[PDB]
Amino acid sequence: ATFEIVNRCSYTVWAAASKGDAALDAGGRQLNSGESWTINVEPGTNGGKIWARTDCYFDDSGSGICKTGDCGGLLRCKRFGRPPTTLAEFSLNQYGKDYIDISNIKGFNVPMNFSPTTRGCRGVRCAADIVGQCPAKLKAPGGGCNDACTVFQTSEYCCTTGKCGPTEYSRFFKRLCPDAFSYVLDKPTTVTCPGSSNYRVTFCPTA
Numbered sequence: 760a761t762f763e764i765v766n767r768c769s770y771t772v773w774a775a776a777s778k779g780d781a782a783l784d785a786g787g788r789q790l791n792s793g794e795s796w797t798i799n800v801e802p803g804t805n806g807g808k809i810w811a812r813t814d815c816y817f818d819d820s821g822s823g824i825c826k827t828g829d830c831g832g833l834l835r836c837k838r839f840g841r842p843p844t845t846l847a848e849f850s851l852n853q854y855g856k857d858y859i860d861i862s863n864i865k866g867f868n869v870p871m872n873f874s875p876t877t878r879g880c881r882g883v884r885c886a887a888d889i890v891g892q893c894p895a896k897l898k899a900p901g902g903g904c905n906d907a908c909t910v911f912q913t914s915e916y917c918c919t920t921g922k923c924g925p926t927e928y929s930r931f932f933k934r935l936c937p938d939a940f941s942y943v944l945d946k947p948t949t950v951t952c953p954g955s956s957n958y959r960v961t962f963c964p965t966a
């Protein structure tokens with residue numbers, strides 16, 4: 760499957776693609792304002808994530824730091840990034856279907872559109888100013904808006920027991936971005952697409 764990753768933001772982001780224990784394609788790249796990065800994702804990939812990282816410094820070896828979404832200091836991510844990270848999430852060719860969502864479960868750093876480029880399903884978007892409106896307790900100094908699980912580490916926020924409800928914090932993410940997961944047991948906003956669909960992830964899709 761082909762993912763076109765587009766930075767429409769006015770600022771540079773460092774895109775990242777991982778399935779948690781391995782890079783997808785090169786695993787990460789700098790995207791200046793307007794730049795597009797096309798990656799190939801193995802069919803059958805289960806639990807893939809794409810995210811943006813902000814305010815990175817990397818040396819010539821691809822070792823450094825990002826203020827949001829850092830994946831153990833690498834340019835080319837092998838593992839998931841540190842919150843806060845708006846997440847494009849996908850499972851491909853699962854019994855003939857692709858499954859896509861946007862999640863705020865690990866917080867929000869960059870607005871995002873995740874849309875198929877092929878026919879047969881709709882895209883999802885979380886493009887609200889969640890950072891500007893972020894409740895004081897969830898504001899990350901690095902930039903971005905943390906999820907309550909990351910900040911408070913409670914059974915309720917992290918849904919550790921598999922029993923949890925919506926919270927004042929989850930309802931904030933949900934009010935601004937209804938088409939994104941706000942907590943672990945949120946009513947699924949997953950979109951079902953044809954197996955072997957292709958997709959575009961757009962950072963800052965509106966502004």
